[PDB]
Tab-separated table of C-alpha atoms and ligand atoms in Angstrom:
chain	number	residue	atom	x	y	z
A	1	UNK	CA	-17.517	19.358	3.619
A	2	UNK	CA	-16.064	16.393	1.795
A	3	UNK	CA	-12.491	16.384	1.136
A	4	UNK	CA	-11.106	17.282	-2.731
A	5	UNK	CA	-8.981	14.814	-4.303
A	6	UNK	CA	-6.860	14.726	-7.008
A	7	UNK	CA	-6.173	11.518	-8.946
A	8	UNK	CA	-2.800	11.773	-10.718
A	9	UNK	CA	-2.709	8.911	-13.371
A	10	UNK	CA	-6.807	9.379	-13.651
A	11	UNK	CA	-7.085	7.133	-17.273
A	12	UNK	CA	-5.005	4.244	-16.120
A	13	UNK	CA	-6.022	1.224	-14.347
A	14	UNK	CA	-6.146	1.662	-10.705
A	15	UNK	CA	-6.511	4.713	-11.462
A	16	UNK	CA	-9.818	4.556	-13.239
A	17	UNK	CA	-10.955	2.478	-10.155
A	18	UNK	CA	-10.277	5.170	-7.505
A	19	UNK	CA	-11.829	7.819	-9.456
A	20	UNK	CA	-15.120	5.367	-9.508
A	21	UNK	CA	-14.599	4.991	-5.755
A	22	UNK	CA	-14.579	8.356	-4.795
A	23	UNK	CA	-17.537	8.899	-7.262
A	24	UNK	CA	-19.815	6.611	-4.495
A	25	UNK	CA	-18.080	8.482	-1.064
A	26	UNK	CA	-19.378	11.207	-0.126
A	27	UNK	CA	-17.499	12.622	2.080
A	28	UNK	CA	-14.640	12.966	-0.977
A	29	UNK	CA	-14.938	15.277	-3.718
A	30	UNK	CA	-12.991	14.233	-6.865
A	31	UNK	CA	-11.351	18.545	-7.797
A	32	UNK	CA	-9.034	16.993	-10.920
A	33	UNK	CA	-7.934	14.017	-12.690
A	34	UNK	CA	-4.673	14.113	-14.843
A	35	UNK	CA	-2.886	11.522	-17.020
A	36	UNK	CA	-0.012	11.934	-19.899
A	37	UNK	CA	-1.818	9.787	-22.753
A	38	UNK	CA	-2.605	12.385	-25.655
A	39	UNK	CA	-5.655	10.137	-26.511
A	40	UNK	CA	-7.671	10.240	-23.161
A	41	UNK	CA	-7.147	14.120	-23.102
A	42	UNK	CA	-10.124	16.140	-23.203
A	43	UNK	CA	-13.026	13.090	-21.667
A	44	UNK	CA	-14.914	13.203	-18.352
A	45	UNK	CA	-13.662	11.607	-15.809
A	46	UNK	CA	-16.257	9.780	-14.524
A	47	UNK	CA	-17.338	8.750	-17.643
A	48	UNK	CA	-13.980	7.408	-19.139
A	49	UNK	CA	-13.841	5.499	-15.952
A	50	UNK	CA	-17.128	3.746	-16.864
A	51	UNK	CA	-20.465	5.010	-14.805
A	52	UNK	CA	-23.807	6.965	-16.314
A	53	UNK	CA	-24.008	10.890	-15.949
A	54	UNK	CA	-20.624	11.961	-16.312
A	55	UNK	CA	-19.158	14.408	-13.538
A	56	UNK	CA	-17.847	18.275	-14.126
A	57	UNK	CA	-13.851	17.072	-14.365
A	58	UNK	CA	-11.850	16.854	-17.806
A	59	UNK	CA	-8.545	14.592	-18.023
A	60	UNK	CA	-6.592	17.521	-18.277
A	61	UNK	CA	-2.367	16.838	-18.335
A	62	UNK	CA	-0.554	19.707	-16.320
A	63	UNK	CA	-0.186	19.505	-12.963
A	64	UNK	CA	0.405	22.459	-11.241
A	65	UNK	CA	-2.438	24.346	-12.740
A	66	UNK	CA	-4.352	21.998	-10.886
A	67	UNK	CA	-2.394	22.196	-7.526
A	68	UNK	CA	-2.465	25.642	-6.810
A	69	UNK	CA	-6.063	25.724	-7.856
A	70	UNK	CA	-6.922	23.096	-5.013
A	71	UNK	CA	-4.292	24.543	-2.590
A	72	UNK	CA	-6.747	28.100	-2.717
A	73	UNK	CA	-8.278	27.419	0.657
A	74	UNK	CA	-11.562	26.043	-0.431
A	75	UNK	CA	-13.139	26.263	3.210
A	76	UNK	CA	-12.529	22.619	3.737
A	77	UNK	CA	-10.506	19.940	4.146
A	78	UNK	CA	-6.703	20.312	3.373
A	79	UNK	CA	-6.393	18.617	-0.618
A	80	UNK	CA	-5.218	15.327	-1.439
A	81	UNK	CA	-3.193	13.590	-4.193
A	82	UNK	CA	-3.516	10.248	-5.085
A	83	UNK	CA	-0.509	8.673	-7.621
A	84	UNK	CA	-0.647	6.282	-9.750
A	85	UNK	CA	1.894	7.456	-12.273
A	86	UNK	CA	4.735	5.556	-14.202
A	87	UNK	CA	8.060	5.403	-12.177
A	88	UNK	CA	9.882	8.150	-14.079
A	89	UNK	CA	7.478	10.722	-12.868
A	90	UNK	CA	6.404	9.522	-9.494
A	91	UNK	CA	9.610	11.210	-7.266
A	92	UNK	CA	8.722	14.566	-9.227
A	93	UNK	CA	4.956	14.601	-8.872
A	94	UNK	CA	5.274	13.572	-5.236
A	95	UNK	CA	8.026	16.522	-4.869
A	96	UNK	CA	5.605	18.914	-6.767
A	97	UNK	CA	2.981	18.085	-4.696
A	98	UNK	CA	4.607	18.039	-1.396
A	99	UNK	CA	6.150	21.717	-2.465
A	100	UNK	CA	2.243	22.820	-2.918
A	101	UNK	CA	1.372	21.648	0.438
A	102	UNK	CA	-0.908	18.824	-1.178
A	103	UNK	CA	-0.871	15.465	0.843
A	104	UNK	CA	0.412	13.010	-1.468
A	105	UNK	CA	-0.934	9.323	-1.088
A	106	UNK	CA	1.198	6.735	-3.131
A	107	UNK	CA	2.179	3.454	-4.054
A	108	UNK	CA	6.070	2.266	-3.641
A	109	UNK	CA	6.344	1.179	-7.042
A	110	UNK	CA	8.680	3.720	-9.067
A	111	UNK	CA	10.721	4.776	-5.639
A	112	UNK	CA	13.998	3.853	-4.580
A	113	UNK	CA	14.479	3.955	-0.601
A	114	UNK	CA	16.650	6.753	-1.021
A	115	UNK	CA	14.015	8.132	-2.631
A	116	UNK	CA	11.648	7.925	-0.315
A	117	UNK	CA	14.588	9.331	2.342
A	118	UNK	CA	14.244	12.552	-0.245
A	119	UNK	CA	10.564	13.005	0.074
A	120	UNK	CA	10.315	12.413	3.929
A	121	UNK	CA	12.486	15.351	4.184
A	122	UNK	CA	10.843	17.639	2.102
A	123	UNK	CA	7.510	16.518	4.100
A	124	UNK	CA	8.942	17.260	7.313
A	125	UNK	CA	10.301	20.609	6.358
A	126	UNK	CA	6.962	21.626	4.290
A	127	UNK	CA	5.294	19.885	7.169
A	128	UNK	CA	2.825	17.975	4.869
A	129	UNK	CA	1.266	15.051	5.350
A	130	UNK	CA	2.258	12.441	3.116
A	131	UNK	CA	1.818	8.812	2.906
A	132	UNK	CA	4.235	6.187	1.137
A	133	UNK	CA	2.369	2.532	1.006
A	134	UNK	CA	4.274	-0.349	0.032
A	135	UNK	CA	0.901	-2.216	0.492
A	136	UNK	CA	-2.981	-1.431	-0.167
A	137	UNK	CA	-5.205	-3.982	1.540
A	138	UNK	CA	-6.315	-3.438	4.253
A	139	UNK	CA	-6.884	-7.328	5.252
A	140	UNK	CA	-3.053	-7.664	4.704
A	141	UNK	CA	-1.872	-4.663	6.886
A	142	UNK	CA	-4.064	-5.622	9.995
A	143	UNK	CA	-2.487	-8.919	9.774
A	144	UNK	CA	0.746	-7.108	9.874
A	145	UNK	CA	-0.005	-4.984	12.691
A	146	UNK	CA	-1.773	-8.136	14.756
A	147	UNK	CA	1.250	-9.941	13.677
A	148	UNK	CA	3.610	-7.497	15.062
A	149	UNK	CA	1.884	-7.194	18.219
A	150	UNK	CA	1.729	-11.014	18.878
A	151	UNK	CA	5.640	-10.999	18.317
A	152	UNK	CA	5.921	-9.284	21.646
A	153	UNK	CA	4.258	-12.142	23.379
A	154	UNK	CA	5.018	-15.073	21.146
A	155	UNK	CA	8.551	-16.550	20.357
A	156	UNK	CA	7.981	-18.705	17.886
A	157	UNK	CA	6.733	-18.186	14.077
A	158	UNK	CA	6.399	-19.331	10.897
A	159	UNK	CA	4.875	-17.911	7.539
A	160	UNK	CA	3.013	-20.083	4.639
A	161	UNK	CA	2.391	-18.420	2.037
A	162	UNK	CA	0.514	-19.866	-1.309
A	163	UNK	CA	0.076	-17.562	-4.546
A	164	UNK	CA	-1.344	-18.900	-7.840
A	165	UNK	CA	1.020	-21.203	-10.141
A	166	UNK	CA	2.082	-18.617	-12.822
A	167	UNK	CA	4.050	-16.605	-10.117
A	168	UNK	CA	8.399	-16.542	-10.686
A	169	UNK	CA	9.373	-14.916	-7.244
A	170	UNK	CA	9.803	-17.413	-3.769
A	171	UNK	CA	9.147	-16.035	-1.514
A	172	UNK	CA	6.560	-13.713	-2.587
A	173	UNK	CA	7.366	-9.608	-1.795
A	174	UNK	CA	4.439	-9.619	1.195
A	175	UNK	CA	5.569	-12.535	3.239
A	176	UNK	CA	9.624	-11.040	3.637
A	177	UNK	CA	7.828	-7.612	3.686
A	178	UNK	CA	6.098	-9.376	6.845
A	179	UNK	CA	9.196	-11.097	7.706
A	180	UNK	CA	10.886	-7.638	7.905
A	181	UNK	CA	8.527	-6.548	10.556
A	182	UNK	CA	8.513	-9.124	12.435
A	183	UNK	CA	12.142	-8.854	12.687
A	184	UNK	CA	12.445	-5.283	13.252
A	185	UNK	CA	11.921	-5.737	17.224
A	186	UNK	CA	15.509	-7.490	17.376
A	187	UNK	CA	13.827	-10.432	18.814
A	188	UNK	CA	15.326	-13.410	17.612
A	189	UNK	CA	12.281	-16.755	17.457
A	190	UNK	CA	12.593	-20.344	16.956
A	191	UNK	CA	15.414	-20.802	18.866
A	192	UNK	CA	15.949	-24.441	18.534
A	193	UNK	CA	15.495	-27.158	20.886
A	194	UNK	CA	16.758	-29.905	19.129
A	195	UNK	CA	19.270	-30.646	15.980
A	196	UNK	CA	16.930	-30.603	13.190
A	197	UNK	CA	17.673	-33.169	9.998
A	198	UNK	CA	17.093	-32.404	6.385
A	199	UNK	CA	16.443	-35.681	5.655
A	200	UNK	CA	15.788	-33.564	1.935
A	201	UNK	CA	16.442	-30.474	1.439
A	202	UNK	CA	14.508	-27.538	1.375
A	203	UNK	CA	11.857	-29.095	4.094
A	204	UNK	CA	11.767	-26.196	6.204
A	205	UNK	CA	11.171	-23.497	4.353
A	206	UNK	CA	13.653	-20.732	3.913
A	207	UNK	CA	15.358	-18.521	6.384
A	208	UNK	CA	14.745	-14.904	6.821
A	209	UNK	CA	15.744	-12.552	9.578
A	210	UNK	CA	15.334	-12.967	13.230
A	211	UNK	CA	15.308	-17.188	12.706
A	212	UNK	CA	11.745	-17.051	11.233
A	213	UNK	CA	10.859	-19.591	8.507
A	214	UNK	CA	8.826	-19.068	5.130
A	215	UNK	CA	7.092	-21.600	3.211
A	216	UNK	CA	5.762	-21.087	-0.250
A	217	UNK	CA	2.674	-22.724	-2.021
A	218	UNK	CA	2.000	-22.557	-6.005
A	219	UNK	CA	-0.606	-24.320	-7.060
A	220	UNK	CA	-3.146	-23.480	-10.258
A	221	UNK	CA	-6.401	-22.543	-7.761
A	222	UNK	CA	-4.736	-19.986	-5.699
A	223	UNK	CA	-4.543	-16.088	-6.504
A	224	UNK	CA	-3.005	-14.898	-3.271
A	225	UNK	CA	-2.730	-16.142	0.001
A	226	UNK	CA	-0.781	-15.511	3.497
A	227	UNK	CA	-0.906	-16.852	6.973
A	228	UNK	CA	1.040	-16.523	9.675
A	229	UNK	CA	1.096	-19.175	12.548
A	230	UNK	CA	2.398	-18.179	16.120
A	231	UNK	CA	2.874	-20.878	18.162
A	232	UNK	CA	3.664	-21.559	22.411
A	233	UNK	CA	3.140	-24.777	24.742
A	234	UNK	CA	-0.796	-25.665	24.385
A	235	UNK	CA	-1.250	-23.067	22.072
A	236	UNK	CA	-1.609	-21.879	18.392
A	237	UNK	CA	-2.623	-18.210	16.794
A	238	UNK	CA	-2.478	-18.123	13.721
A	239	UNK	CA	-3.954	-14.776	11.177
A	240	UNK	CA	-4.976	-15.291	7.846
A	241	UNK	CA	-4.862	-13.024	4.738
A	242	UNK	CA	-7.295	-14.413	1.216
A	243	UNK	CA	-7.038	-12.577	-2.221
A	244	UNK	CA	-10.674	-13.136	-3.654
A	245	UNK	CA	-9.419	-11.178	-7.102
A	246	UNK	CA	-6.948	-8.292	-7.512
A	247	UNK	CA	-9.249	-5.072	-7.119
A	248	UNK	CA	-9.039	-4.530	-2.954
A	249	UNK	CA	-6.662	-2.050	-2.659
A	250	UNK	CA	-9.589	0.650	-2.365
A	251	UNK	CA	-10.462	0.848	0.769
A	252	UNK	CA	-6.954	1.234	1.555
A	253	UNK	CA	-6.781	3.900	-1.337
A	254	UNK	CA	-9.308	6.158	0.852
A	255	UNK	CA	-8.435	4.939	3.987
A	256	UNK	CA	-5.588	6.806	3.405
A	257	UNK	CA	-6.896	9.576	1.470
A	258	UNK	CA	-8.160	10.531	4.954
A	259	UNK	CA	-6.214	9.574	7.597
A	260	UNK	CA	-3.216	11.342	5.132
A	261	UNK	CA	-5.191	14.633	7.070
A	262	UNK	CA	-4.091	13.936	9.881
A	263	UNK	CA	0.054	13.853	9.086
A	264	UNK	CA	2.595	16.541	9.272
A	265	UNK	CA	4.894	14.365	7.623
A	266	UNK	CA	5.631	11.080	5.830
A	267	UNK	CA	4.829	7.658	6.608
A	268	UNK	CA	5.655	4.580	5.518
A	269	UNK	CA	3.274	1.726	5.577
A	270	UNK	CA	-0.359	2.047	6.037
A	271	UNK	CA	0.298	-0.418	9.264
A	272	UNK	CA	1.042	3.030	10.933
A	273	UNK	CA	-2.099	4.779	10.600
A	274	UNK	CA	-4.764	1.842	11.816
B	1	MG	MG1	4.282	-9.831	-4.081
């Protein structure tokens, strides 16, 4: 009894992707996919997407139609929404969605923190599931939960980081992300045992939260890159996150699609459900 999906944003990008994804799992059935563009209107799916036969699902543009039509009990799993949807929209489709009793799953993009404070309310009171994910690889949020765990035990940490050349930000959204949670515990690391000189500046990284240390790479070669190095007398851990090229958020995609099932209200950060 695979589980029915809708795929808000169906023509775009990512969203193209997902809709092939669910396509090859079978244990999720693809009920509707919707976008605004005028142009991609009345196509398969499946097709537009890019694979052979094309499925039974149009690119149709109104959403509710399509929400109350999943949330008729189909016998089955509980219905699922997956966003991909430019900013202005993304609070209200969410919001629509969550109103329905559909479980959103969602990317941070387009949301405020306030936001987000919104739409966990409306969750809790409509008691849906509904999953907020500042982060889609799977690879990365392990080595956020590992990294988090290890905190407990180590007191000392740094984080190198090394993206490709082109890249403006330093450091990089992931690594403070990481340094965030790290520093959440109120656990302070690194305290110092000795005066440290700059002999020139800007040797030790930067500073962020809880005394932990960031250090960031750009070099033409590199796409994107984290590791996180925990250290203690006679002893070094260190976890490792490599980008290969920019198409892995997908397992995270339906990783969430079904552990969003099992929520009775929002969550923020894969990290929490693995
Ligand atoms: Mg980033």
């Amino acid at each position: 009894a695979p589980i029915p999906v809708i795929v808000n944003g169906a023509a775009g990008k990512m969203g193209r992707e997902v809709v092939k994804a669910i396509a090859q799992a079978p244990d999720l059935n693809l009920l509707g996919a919707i976008d605004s563009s005028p142009e991609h209107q009345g196509k398969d799916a499946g097709e537009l997407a890019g694979l052979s036969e094309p499925l039974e699902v149009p690119i149709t543009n109104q959403l509710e139609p399509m929400l109350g039509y999943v949330a008729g009990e189909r016998q089955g799993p509980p219905g699922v929404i997956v966003d991909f949807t430019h900013p202005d929209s993304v609070y209200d489709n969410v919001r629509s969605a969550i109103a329905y009793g559909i479980r959103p799953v969602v990317g941070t993009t387009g949301l405020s923190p306030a936001q987000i404070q919104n739409l966990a309310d409306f969750a809790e009171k409509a008691s849906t599931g509904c999953l907020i994910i500042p982060n889609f690889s799977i690879g990365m949020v392990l080595l956020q939960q590992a990294a988090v765990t290890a905190s407990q035990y180590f007191d000392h940490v740094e984080i190198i980081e090394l993206h490709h050349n082109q890249k403006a930000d330093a450091p990089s959204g992931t690594a403070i992300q990481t340094a965030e949670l790290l520093a959440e515990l109120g656990k302070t690391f690194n305290s110092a045992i000795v005066e440290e000189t700059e002999k020139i500046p800007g040797a030790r990284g930067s500073l962020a939260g809880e005394g932990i240390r960031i250090h960031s790479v750009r070099l033409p070669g590199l796409i994107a890159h984290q590791e996180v190095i925990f250290g203690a007398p006679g002893q070094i851990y260190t976890l490792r996150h490599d980008t290969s090229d920019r198409a892995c958020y997908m397992p995270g995609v339906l990783l969430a699609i079904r552990k969003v099932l099992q929520l009775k209200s929002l969550v923020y950060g894969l990290e929490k459900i693995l």
